[PDB]
Write a protein that binds this ligand. Structure first.
Ligand SMILES: NC(=O)c1ccc[n+]([C@@H]2O[C@H](COP(=O)([O-])OP(=O)(O)OC[C@H]3O[C@@H](n4cnc5c(N)ncnc54)[C@H](OP(=O)(O)O)[C@@H]3O)[C@@H](O)[C@H]2O)c1
Ligand SMILES: C[C@]12CCC(=O)C=C1CC[C@@H]1[C@@H]2CC[C@]2(C)C(=O)CC[C@@H]12
Length: 325
């Protein structure tokens, strides 16, 4: 079923997605130029065929550079690569959707993206500033309309600029608002959310499965733990005693165990790493499997505590984390 050479799982629209991808977020201020490009190329050489990025990460051009060079090398064909892009909060005005995607297509120098998703369910005031706030530090929000934005996304697919549509950071209510929309033409094929052994997403996963929506786990290794976004109160996932003990059973690292955990349950993982050794390590999860008991042991680690709470936007009408799921 899942092997290094063939590991694509089905999407409800007829397309498919590699069960493991390379995450590409890296702090802009302290990340050397070229580190992303180099990493993406190392990943493709390693065997990865899926790359996750976003215009707001500020390195989307580097992802494109790497993908085009490898195609030019004859390493892969455009159809062999799966790239996911994202529409940020400051770009939810319907008429802004296509222009925003076209901007990313320019940056990448590609004809289309394989997956385009609404980054967050919250709308922010339009503009160049990714994180808008007035002189008093008050966030500049905009009025959300998930159905009008979704229709704009559907138009992008019809025009051939993207293969599949999806969302990120959506809770159950926000998903059903789209699923029950009158005249729905293209239903969400995936929902990218935080998911790992400390936050297994049991109810949201079950719901998505019932609707043929595939969950992509972001921060599958528990994040880089940057105090600005991470609830450092929760201990380091990769230091967990059990996860490390289970690794010794197969001569695998904790990271490898947590990644295998999610892919074995049908959850796509997009671990980020700009380190040669680690990029390779994270991909070695097809030469072993976890027993039924081990899957249960890992599941029991769930604390129902998120590393990514986004508390700075807790008062936004569409803040996704107030509901149980
Ligand atoms: N849609 C959204 O709202 C959203 C939000 C957050 C993240 N994401 C996506 O999800 C991707 C993954 O999440 P993430 O970057 O937050 O965190 P992550 O994948 O959990 O990884 C965090 C840190 O783990 C380290 N690491 C990687 N492999 C390792 C290994 N084998 N052993 C020990 N440490 C290892 C990395 O350091 P090195 O690079 O030094 O190896 C990295 O800084 C992102 O890059 C992004 O593409 C999406
Ligand atoms: C990757 C990241 C930084 C390093 C870290 O330690 C934890 C996170 C998770 C939340 C990410 C953030 C980067 C900026 C993002 C994309 C947003 O604008 C909303 C979600 C947020």
């Amino acid at each position: 079923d899942l092997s290094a050479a063939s590991h694509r799982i089905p999407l409800s629209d007829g397309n498919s997605i590699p069960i493991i991808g390379l995450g590409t977020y890296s702090e802009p201020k302290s990340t050397p130029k070229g580190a992303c490009a180099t990493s993406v190329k190392v990943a493709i050489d390693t065997g990865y065929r899926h790359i996750d990025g976003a215009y707001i990460y500020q390195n989307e051009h580097e992802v494109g550079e790497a993908i085009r060079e490898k195609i030019a090398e004859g390493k892969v064909r455009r159809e062999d690569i799966f790239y996911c892009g994202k529409l940020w909060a400051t770009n939810h005005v319907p008429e802004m959707v296509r222009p925003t995607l076209e901007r990313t297509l320019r940056v990448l120098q590609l004809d289309y993206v394989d997956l385009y998703i609404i980054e967050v369910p919250m709308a922010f005031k339009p503009g160049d500033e990714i994180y808008p706030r007035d002189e008093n530090g008050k966030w500049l929000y905009h009025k959300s309309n998930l159905c009008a934005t979704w229709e704009a996304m559907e138009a992008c697919k019809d025009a051939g600029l993207v293969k599949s549509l999806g969302v990120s950071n959506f809770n159950r209510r926000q998903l059903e608002l789209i699923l029950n929309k009158p005249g729905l033409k293209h239903k969400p094929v995936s929902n990218q959310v935080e998911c790992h052994p400390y936050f297994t997403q049991p109810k949201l996963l079950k719901f998505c499965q019932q609707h043929d929506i595939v969950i992509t786990a972001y921060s599958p290794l528990g994040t880089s733990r940057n105090p600005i976004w991470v609830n450092v109160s929760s201990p380091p996932l990769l230091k967990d005693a059990l996860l490390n003990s289970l690794g010794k059973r197969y001569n695998k690292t904790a990271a490898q165990i947590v990644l295998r955990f999610n892919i074995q349950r049908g959850v796509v993982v997009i671990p980020k790493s700009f380190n040669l050794e680690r990029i390779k390590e994270n991909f070695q999860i097809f030469d072993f499997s976890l027993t039924e008991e081990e899957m249960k042991d890992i599941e029991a680690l769930n604390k129902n505590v998120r590393f990514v709470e986004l508390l700075m936007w807790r008062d936004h009408p569409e803040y996704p984390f107030h509901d149980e799921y």
